[PDB]
Amino acid sequence: MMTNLMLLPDGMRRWSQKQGISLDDSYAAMTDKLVEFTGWAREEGFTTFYVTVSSVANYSRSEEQVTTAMNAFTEVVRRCHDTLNFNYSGTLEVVPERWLTELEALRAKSDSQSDFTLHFIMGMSLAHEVIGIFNKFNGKIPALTEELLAANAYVPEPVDFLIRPGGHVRMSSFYPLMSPFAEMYFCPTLLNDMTRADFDVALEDLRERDRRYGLYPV
Amino acid sequence: MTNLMLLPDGMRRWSQKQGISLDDSYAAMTDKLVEFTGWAREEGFTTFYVTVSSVANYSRSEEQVTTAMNAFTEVVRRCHDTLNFNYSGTLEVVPERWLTELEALRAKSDSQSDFTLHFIMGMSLAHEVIGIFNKFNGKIPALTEELLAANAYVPEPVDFLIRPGGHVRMSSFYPLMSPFAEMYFCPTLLNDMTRADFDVALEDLRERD
Numbered sequence A: 001m002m003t004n005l006m007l008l009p010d011g012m013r014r015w016s017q018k019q020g021i022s023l024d025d026s027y028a029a030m031t032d033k034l035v036e037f038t039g040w041a042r043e044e045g046f047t048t049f050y051v052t053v054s055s056v057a058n059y060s061r062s063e064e065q066v067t068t069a070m071n072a073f074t075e076v077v078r079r080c081h082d083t084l085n086f087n088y089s090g091t092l093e094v095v096p097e098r099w100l101t102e103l104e105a106l107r108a109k110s111d112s113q114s115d116f117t118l119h120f121i122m123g124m125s126l127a128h129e130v131i132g133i134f135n136k137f138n139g140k141i142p143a144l145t146e147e148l149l150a151a152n153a154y155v156p157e158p159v160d161f162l163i164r165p166g167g168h169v170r171m172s173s174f175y176p177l178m179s180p181f182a183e184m185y186f187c188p189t190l191l192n193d194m195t196r197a198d199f200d201v202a203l204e205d206l207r208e209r210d211r212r213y214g215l216y217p218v
Numbered sequence B: 001m002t003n004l005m006l007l008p009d010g011m012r013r014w015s016q017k018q019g020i021s022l023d024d025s026y027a028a029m030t031d032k033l034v035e036f037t038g039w040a041r042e043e044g045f046t047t048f049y050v051t052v053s054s055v056a057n058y059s060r061s062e063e064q065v066t067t068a069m070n071a072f073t074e075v076v077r078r079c080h081d082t083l084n085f086n087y088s089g090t091l092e093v094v095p096e097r098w099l100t101e102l103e104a105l106r107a108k109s110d111s112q113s114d115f116t117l118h119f120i121m122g123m124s125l126a127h128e129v130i131g132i133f134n135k136f137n138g139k140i141p142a143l144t145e146e147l148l149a150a151n152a153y154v155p156e157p158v159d160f161l162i163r164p165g166g167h168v169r170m171s172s173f174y175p176l177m178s179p180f181a182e183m184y185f186c187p188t189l190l191n192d193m194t195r196a197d198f199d200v201a202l203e204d205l206r207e208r209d
């Protein structure tokens, strides 16, 4: 069984306020922690490590906040892109061109033959995703099929495991469209405080679960 | 003007725990759901959503589908006279007998009640999107957030979502247009849920913001 993993990052402002440090340093710690998380996910045999980078609404923040966040996320790819396959998707039209250009170049320079993939999803929002798909195919086809929908969703496959640190038990705009049976794990520990042990007990929890897919066992 | 959504789970597990049949466990679920509707109404929620089934659920055996659909329909048989009942979802995968009875019960419900019980059947974001597209294909210049919200299975954003039974997952029950929904999971099986469990769940959900 080949599994994949998805991380929902949040709590950089909470960590910066809690520590009495700047938002920029909090995001630098987020970059370090995300490099760590990518390493851990690769060590644990996950085929793809998904990171829900941002929602559409996040790009309504101030220019500086968007620059800091997008730079922090991009630095992860700058550091690890040489040894893995990098890809990205989402509501790309709301992402500033600077980051689309740099992330495209980094995607071109990544090892597309690697057995491990880091995938960023930016501008996540089920409303915008569905509206984009509908408008793309509106009137041009007799009916939308599961295959087309799967081929045009932001996340190109069902997600197996989903982890959200930071104490919020909610999905926000990050729920994957084609993942009805994804397993969810929440923990109060902030992302920048997550240790390898926290990750490991999370994986104990997630791998302990019996996956039914809506059916009774046989 | 708040609403609540319940994801039922733990009927087979409860039947095994109590040493009873699946039908008996689902009868206990019927009683428990009548109770839950009462609790939700007393707490001021305008609409109580219950995720009856997913698309995958109808791939179960005929006996299992009949047991579940009968218990859920029995809830409406008991409560339809005192509240407003409505339903939605991927209706084409629901057996016609149950759609017929549920439609008749919806027509007989109190459409003037300030409280609504709403079943969603055959839940699946893929099938929901496919159905919306097929419904509006070529009939509109472009899909808007307003139209999408007006035609999704759940017709409004969900405030609170509760899943007892110990499984931390949506199992195809995620409400499409609820980006700000708060989720509460608890290990207590649905059939073991008391009013106090509901109340502390509401404490947890209301403490957050």
Ligand SMILES: CC(C)=CCC/C(C)=C/COP(=O)(O)OP(=O)(O)O
Binding pocket: A009, A010, A011, A012, A013, A014, A015, A053, A054, A055, A058, A059, A061, A065, A066, A069, A070, A166
């Ligand atoms: C393009 C942009 C702006 C991306 C935003 C990056 C992000 C995941 C912020 C969430 O953390 P938070 O600081 O908002 O959480 P908290 O307030 O709890 O610290």
Ligand SMILES: CC(C)=CCC/C(C)=C/COP(=O)(O)OP(=O)(O)O
Binding pocket: B008, B009, B010, B011, B012, B013, B014, B052, B053, B054, B057, B058, B060, B064, B065, B068, B069, B165
């Ligand atoms: C039409 C159908 C089949 C509806 C199914 C409704 C449902 C998800 C019940 C959950 O309890 P359960 O039956 O899965 O019990 P348990 O959690 O113990 O397996």
Ligand SMILES: [Mg+2]
Binding pocket: A212, B009, B010
């Ligand atoms: Mg179940």
